[PDB]
């Protein structure tokens, strides 16, 4: 955070916050490029997965930056400018998930971005603890999550419709509805039940 002993201070955490911000902005740019064509090409796959690995590594740093709950680092990064990139990644998540789900071959990159979401909320949960009761950090958490709150609809629809997917596909009129008891169910009859 500071290097007390040296003359000129260097706050290396704010620099890599800015680096994540630039990474996020260019990931958003990649999204706007593929936002129209929507059949994602293998070169864009192979490039963008590597970019997701980059983002995963830097979120792993940001976890282990504040994984020890040292409060000066909390006060620094909570004040810091990363919160735009939070909202931007959430936008990226919600708007990628749709076409990643709708396409067969894109499940690998869906696994990648899924994993990035996992590390995203790991980092958020890590920095989301140091609260007496409310905290100005807690204020800012809730406020910018509410500022995010359009795409949250999409990710919760995504989660519940892949969740009670798994729940209802053992229910009353599925498991016997196939003749084999195996899942050779016709998809229109699947829609119907």
């Amino acid at each position: 955070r500071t290097q007390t002993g040296n003359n000129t201070t260097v706050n290396i955490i704010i620099s890599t916050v800015d680096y994540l911000l630039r990474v996020q902005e260019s990931i958003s740019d990649f999204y706007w490029y593929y936002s129209g064509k929507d059949v994602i090409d293998e070169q864009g796959q192979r490039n963008f997965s590597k970019a997701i690995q980059v983002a995963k590594q830097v979120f792993n740093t940001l976890t282990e930056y504040i994984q020890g709950p040292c409060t000066g680092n909390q006060q620094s990064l909570a004040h810091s400018r990363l919160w735009d990139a939070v909202v931007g990644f959430l936008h990226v998540f919600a708007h990628m998930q749709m076409k990643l789900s709708q396409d067969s071959s894109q499940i690998e990159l869906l696994k990648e971005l899924m994993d990035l979401q996992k590390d995203m909320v790991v980092m958020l949960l890590s920095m989301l603890e140091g609260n007496v009761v409310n905290g100005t950090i807690g204020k800012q958490m809730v406020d910018m999550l509410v500022e995010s709150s359009n795409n949250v609809e999409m990710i919760l629809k995504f989660f519940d419709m892949f969740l009670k997917l798994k729940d209802l596909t053992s229910s009353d009129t599925f498991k016997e509805y196939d003749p084999d008891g195996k899942g050779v169910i016709s998809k229109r009859d699947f829609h119907k039940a």
């Binding site: 902005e25 999204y31 706007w32 936002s35 129209g36 400018r81 735009d84 359009n150």
Partner: protein, 387 residues
């Protein structure tokens, strides 16, 4: 602290005309002029400029790729697209709207200047369709970044998206050249702004007795007398009053007590010029000094300075009574005595100063400034054909 949707601001230059900071702001005319022009605020003490023909509303804020996606859909604007209120970052593309007209800022294809070739001019079209009404924002400071928040008070650069030209300060004109020009953004009225039934600076409104404060009708003097009148003169046009403070920034804040009040009468365009040597009178724009006409309001008859925000919702409309104190004289508006009841600025006033205050509506002002726009056009017409 920053800028979002509906944060209505101004765009003002500080030209160095003869090595003096000519703080001229951009005047959007409309309703008789598709162009734009400038408006000085240097002699704001004595030649008070208008605010209402100068402001713009931050309508929308999107990235380049999102805008080109909107262009790819050749309404509903993708349901916002964006926020929320979409807090401004540099490199966003924006829509601006002259709030009085309903026009939108566009680049021209014409050559209505010098010209000084292929570098276009400034227009105010109707509809945001096409590319002409979109504006990239760039920091005019390498110290500050693109992608971070647009601060209060940033001299920056605005470039088109259709013509992709630098919005330049010509000579005194404004054009889409290839050369840059700083542009100041001051939070006038923002945001949101603020709640209804509240006295907001920079607002056209009436002036009720409890009966109004009237001007003489058509064919009068140049209408310079000031009287009371009862009845439906509220519904009549000439009972309208626009407030101005001495504040340029945060001029569209709330109206709190004891602050300056530059009473521009609407339908004349004139000012409520207290010449307390004689009485409460009416004079033009170039007359209007501070100590000539700027007033302060007290809650009582007996008798702050500055906040850099909206301020408190100080005075309502219904259960609210103000009392008019001039700064330089301390007078108080009472009357004297076919209701042509002459109102005077007096050291004491009666109990008959219990003014009630009512606002106006949008279409009322949309008629009102159009009225004298028409008048000052056809006075030129009359004088030219009399010549």
């Amino acid at each position: 602290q920053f800028l979002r949707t509906d944060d209505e601001v101004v765009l003002q230059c500080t030209a160095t005309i003869h090595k003096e900071q000519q703080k001229l702001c951009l005047a959007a005319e409309g309703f008789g002029n598709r162009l734009c022009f400038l408006e000085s605020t240097s002699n704001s003490k004595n030649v008070p400029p208008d605010l209402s023909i100068c402001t713009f509303v931050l309508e929308q804020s999107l990235s380049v790729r999102a805008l080109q996606e909107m262009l790819a859909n050749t309404f509903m604007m993708k349901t916002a697209q964006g926020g929320g209120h979409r807090t401004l970052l540099y490199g966003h593309a924006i829509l601006l709207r002259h709030s009085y007209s309903g026009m939108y800022l566009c680049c021209l294809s014409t050559s209505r200047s010098s010209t000084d070739k292929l570098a276009f001019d400034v227009g105010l079209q109707e509809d945001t369709t096409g590319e002409a009404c979109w504006w990239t924002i760039h920091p005019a400071s390498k110290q500050r970044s693109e992608g971070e928040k647009v601060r209060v008070g940033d001299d920056l650069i605005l470039v088109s998206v259709s013509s992709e030209r630098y919005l330049h300060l010509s000579y005194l004109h404004v054009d889409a050249a290839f050369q840059q020009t700083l542009w100041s953004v001051a939070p006038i009225s923002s945001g949101s702004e603020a709640a209804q039934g509240y006295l907001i600076g920079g607002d056209v409104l009436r002036l009720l007795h409890g009966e109004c404060l009237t001007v003489p009708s058509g064919e009068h003097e140049q209408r310079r007398t000031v009287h009371y009148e009862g009845g439906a003169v509220s519904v009549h046009a000439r009972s309208l009053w626009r407030l101005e403070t001495l504040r340029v920034a945060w001029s569209g804040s709330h109206i709190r007590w004891g602050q300056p009040f530059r009473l521009r009468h609407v339908t004349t365009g004139k000012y409520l010029s207290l010449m307390e040597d004689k009485s409460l009178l009416l004079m033009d724009k170039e007359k209007a000094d501070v100590k000539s006409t700027a007033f302060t309001f007290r809650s009582s008859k007996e008798k702050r300075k500055e906040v850099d925000g909206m301020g408190t919702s100080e005075i309502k409309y219904g259960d609210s009574v103000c009392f008019i104190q001039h700064i330089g004289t301390g007078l108080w508006l009472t009357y004297q005595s076919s209701i042509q009841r002459k109102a005077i600025m007096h050291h004491e006033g009666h109990m008959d100063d219990g003014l009630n205050l009512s606002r106006s509506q949008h279409e009322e002002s949309r008629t009102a400034r159009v009225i004298r726009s028409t008048v000052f056009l056809f006075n030129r017409f009359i004088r030219g054909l009399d010549a």
